[model samples]
Target chain A: SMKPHLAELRQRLAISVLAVFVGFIIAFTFHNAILGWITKPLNNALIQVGKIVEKREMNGMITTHQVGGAFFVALKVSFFAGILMAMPVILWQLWLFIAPGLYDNEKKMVLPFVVGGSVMFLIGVLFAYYVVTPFGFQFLITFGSFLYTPLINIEDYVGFFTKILIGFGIAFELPVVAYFLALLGLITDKTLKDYFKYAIVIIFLLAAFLTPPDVLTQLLMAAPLILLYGLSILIVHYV
Target chain B: SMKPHLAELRQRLAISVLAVFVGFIIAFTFHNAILGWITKPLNNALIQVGKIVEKREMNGMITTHQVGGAFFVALKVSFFAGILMAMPVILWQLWLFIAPGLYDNEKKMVLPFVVGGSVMFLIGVLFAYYVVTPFGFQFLITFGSFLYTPLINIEDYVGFFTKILIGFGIAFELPVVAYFLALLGLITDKTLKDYFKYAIVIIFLLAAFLTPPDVLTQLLMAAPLILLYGLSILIVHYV
Candidate 1:
């Protein structure tokens, strides 16, 4: 039993890596667009911050702060976007491995789990892209606009974007985790309620760790987390 | 017995309210300095944002949007400061009221509870005034600096100041609450650890409710909440 399980795990791992690799290639092909999409928030902030200067002939933009920085940033962006694009396949593979171990009744949940998980993850990614980043980048850029014009760097921007996007994607998994754990008889609404305060501190700590060392960015990440945990409590309760 | 308890409660209530009233009068007498002190962060940000203009000939300052805005703001500031100044008396009255209900050993905690609680509250207020407000006000003002020069209103500034100062003061009471609860055998470290996540969600929720509707301010409040909760856990455990 252990050997078969180990072999199957190895096979699934190989397939998952292969999937990510294929995604990486696809992303690399459109790396320019992907990079632009990821950096949209930062660009918007820069434009807003330098609106007067831009009108006066100076343009606001991010730059490569190191040799080959742009190239490396492009590569990193593609890899992150690749993993995002391959999320469905990875989720499906996860279900395939875990499904056999669950009871027959539990097996039917595969579709909901896969679809819901993917949707939540995507929502998290989109939220970070659309809502959180704009405010965060704007705050960071203009917070010091009085001191100097912002000279944002490409590599640093990519790193910040990836951290927030991925962090949110993971954060959004709370409800799904709650649902599964509830099904397994491991946790319930009472358990969630009991642990509510603990969850909050941990959430903020995680938010702090996941975002740039700024309160604005951390709270942007934390707001939804608190909401998601509430949803999770209701989910676990109902389940 | 019930009649005596009621009479004692009424007496304590009268004393507490009287203490606050006295505090209010004292604060009102120096309302100018108190208002200036509270609005110091806003002034600093305005000064920084308009440094160039100031050097040229113009000045940056907060203004009264309404004819009586400055006077009302001063009154509000004095009232808040009065309450703060009367904290020790209010705490003493509280202990006097509740002391009879506790066991002999428990009643001895009055001094520590009062002193610790006051210090924590003051620390929280100071943290907000010193650290959080500077960053928060700077972010708010400069966020739109490129668009227009900030003409901050006294009323709005006072509201923001009171919200953050009072909010932080309250948020810092977590460890004290935990210590008291632990002493009463009402909670323990294990209970805290178990409820960690839930507390975090609640903390953020409270932070959101307490601060201005901005991520920066909310996170500033939440950061210490998380830290205080951790401290509470350690305290509860040791107690």
Candidate 2:
């Protein structure tokens, strides 16, 4: 039998899995609050632009179109919240798996790498939360205004919401990858500096890809990049 | 009394100043769009939430509280636009200042850092343009919606706008500092791993600072960190 290693693996798996279950319980309790907090931006937009059809300000509200829309949104919300709740237990269990094999010197290195990477990731998340999604949602929430109506399904909004949050959270991890690669000797400061010229064209291309083909949005996207590129030249020789 | 470097610095300064003067001319042609684009969130809030007391939608138009508000705003707008238009010359003069001192290898590093920093800065700008200011403006603009007429002076709005724009643009450069240090070998991967726990604590603290003073946002911040840490641990031994 695949006994000892299997035993350890099974135990680790059970704890983390069980931790997630416990997380689900706590998250479900906090479900309504989570939904309330998540919809702050939505509410702001609603209160602002919503039609006051027939003397009453059309109080903005989210609706579930599907029969199970609320169910799905609640489950989704619980999953994210549970992840938050179960995270300590989950992370601890994972660290336990790796900590044993590392040398004392190597162990010391763990804290810094983990911390650095963690901050890098968090900074990205905040940047995403605090930055990109607001405009994204703003442009979006003006969906069926003027004559039309928007009975927004909660599941749909959360779907887009979580995607933006998590996607940006990961995308912002580029520097961590860059730093790690630098440590592994795969790249250098000079390496990034040298090839960076070509990267500009690609970056512009990416801007083109990510942005709508409107002259305004395109110009808006490209303008900052031009200025940033100009500023970036200063850091090249030194860093 | 001054050396060649100072002489070049002055020359560069003079040229850049002239570049801005030139930039003023170019920016002026696009003045209407410039201010319109710049104060998108401002106008957006006005249309959304500003009390429609008068016959027309008060659409919270930006006003000049001061006589010189328009004059100064127009001046500032052109200057920035000129910087955009004359960026080629401005950056050229700057490049002339720094590029001469660099070696062939050092010169190679220029492109990567420039592109890298540009993309990073662009990311920061979008985040600023999208997330940070929207949140800020949303709160401030709705200051007693029905009654208090906001006579948003040009100079005040401009000051608030630029400060928020530049502050976030620069603030998002943390990872640049990280990878830069890593490239210098000043901070190894190990150091990050070791201190990550305390860093995580501080990270959560910072998250609390950015988010509303509640557990939700901060907890969400903490959750992914642990997830990333665990995921990284899995990658370590196996890789």
Candidate 3:
């Protein structure tokens, strides 16, 4: 029985990796489009900052100081996109791996968890893309505009963008974590309330660590985590 | 007893007004510093935008179109700062007015409520001053930088800043409201859950109304409100 469980987990993980690889291949084909999309917020921010700075139309540029920078960026973008596209498969694989250990009644949560998790993850991604990204880029890009025109490297830009997306995507899982913990009787609403202050302190520290060393970015990141903590408490209460 | 209550109410209101007037006088003595502080975010944003646009030293200016505009703007700034400085006295006065109606045990909640309320309100003010204001100004100022130079009027800027501060301060009172409502049996955790979706919808609408007609500002406003709403539910649950 132990060997069977180990073998099953290995299979599930392999399939998940395979799914991502396939997604990566597919995403690479449209890497240009993904690149365009990924750079949109920075582009808009640059243009706005550039215009106000000069009263002239300006395009935000992501440059490559290295000869092969563009190629590497494209690959990174493709892999990131691939992971996102393969999210459903990974979640399914995750469910399958965990299903055997769950009771028949508990197993019913699979569909909702998979679907809800995917939605929440995407919401985080979108929230970063639409709301947090633009402001973040604007602040940083304009920060040096007072004395210098920012020459952002493609690698650095892509890395930062991906970091935000992944950070948000992971942070948004608070409710899901709460659900499982409550179901297992690991936490309750009272526990959450009792630890609220500690959670806030940690949330800010995490935000500071995750974001660029800017108070704006840290606050932006922390605000949502705080909200999610509140929501997690609510979720536990209901459970 | 009724006459005494009316007289007490009148005295409390008069004292509150006196506190604000005194605060206004003290704030006005430092109006220049206050104005500088108020405009710091916009100034920094403008300098960044200006420097990048032209690669030169620049100062963000708050212009006055009329002869008396500066004078009027100073008054406005003074009043806003005065109100903020008088917050503790105002809260204390409010508690005094309401104290007579509550029983002995119920009345004991006053100290915590006053202190907590003041802290929460200041936290909101600081959040807006430090975080949201910078981004909002950056986006708006740079929006037209491509085609025009921004000439922000002192009056308009002060009004907008005050709006954000007040909006956040009021929004952050969710916990206090939750406490009172729950105590009065007007709402419970279940009711909050039932209306979660509705509250979100209304919160966004409120944000839209309070903020400039921009997605960034609206989202910034709404995010905190949503967080506060989640917090309010927890407070109610405990009550």
Candidate 4:
């Protein structure tokens, strides 16, 4: 029995490592396609707003940047994306390795969690793309126009876009984590209530850390965090 | 007994609604402060690079597309940030509403999940802020310098910043959601694997939907999503 369990753990770990490694390789190989996809939103926005200008007419245009810059930028984006893509497999492997130690009841308890977690995560990503990314690009492009000429570098554009998408994706996991802690009795609804004021302060500080140093951005980040905290408390109380 | 449960749910819902309202109100009330914070990074960047020009000297350096455009831009950024801040709480409320009906074993499992989920979400947010946002902004600003003249509108700047932060925050929830789903037994590793090809296709399509028109951004989003899907499979398999 011990041998079987040990074998399972080892197998899981091997698979996890293999998946991550393959993910990295695939990301590297398809860097170009990845880059193109990432930049599509900004490009579409520009086209929609009728802001496309010819390269030749851009001699004095501050917005004209090296075309090649985008390619390298795209490459970096693809690489990171690959790492993110592989993360779940790694975590799953971890779960597998640990699962044998869990009782039957424990295993049953964990089932919904696995599924809900994935769905919530995907929803978060979709929200980032449909609601957040487009609005951001639109705002940024227009802001650029307010400046001298607003020529953008491909690398910089890619960098910002990638960061935003990734950021939103990550921040949205608040409830799941909060619920877990609550269920474990590591924290309590009462504690959460008493600490609410402090939590707000922490959220703001967190916002400061997570967002570019802009008041609006910090507030944007902080506001959501605070709400999540409160929600977490409620979740814990009910659960 | 049912009455008690209903009452508890009602109470929870009331609290959640209040939390959301309060969160949004606070976000809106302190919008200026929030906008200032978001712009801090860009302002610091410009100052560090010695890009700030004297107002008089730079007069007529660029055309004012609209008077008071900056203020409006800043306002827009704050508003968006407010919305982002509210998301976690909104989701939290959603979770709380559903959590009470879970069985004892299920409730016990929720504890680790809550903790893990929260930590993961925070990680996602920080990753976007520190790693992704800066790079993206730097690229865009620098790129703009190469063409006509770079005069950025405050409104547009803030909007972009807000959107990007929110987007990243949301995107990072993939693993958390996946784990939960797997726990529910609604999906399994085998099913996940079987749908792997379809998932990749969906990811690419999603990338196309989310990113700027550039193939690069789409690739960035798609590549990560596909990897995440695979990761989900691994997670579900063991759980």
Clashing pairs in 3: A51-B145, A51-B146, A52-B145, A52-B146, A145-B51, A145-B52, A146-B51
Query: How well is each residue in B1-239 modelled by candidate 3, as lDDT tens digits?
Result: 58988888889889888988899899889987888788788778888788666753333354433222355566667877787788788888887777777889767766776677777877888898888888887888778777776756565677778878877777776777678667868778898999988989999999898777999989988888888887887898777
lDDT per residue (tens digit) for residues A8-63 in model 1: 88898888888888998898898878876876777789888787445646434564
Looking at model 3, give its docking quality level: incorrect
lDDT of 3 by residue, A123-217 (tens): 98889889888787777556445433455567767887887788787778667868866886877788889998788899999989977664545
The sequence of per-residue lDDT tens digits that candidate 4 reaches over residues B35-72 is: 55776667555543335333424611222222224434
Q: Give, for candidate 4 chain A, the lowest lDDT window spanning 10 residues.
A: A55-64
Better of 1 and 4 by lDDT: 1
Instruction: List ranges where model 2 is wrong by over 4 Å.
Output: A1-3, A51-60, A143-148, A180-186, A189-239, B1-239
Q: What is the fnat of candidate 4?
A: 0.12
Task: List the candidate 1 regions with Cα displacement exceeding 4 Å.
Answer: A1-239, B52-59, B131-136, B176-189, B204-224, B231-239
> DockQ for model 4?
0.06
What DockQ does candidate 1 have relative to the true complex?
A: 0.01
lDDT of 1 by residue, B180-231 (tens): 7787788777778989879889989988997756454576578878888888
Predicted complexes: DockQ each? 0.01, 0.01, 0.01, 0.06
lDDT of 2 by residue, B1-239 (tens): 56978988998999888887777777877776777777788877666655444534432455433212344465676665676677668777877888977888668766676667667766877898898777778667776555676645455677678656754555555556456545645555566678787977886876687556789978965675555554444433232
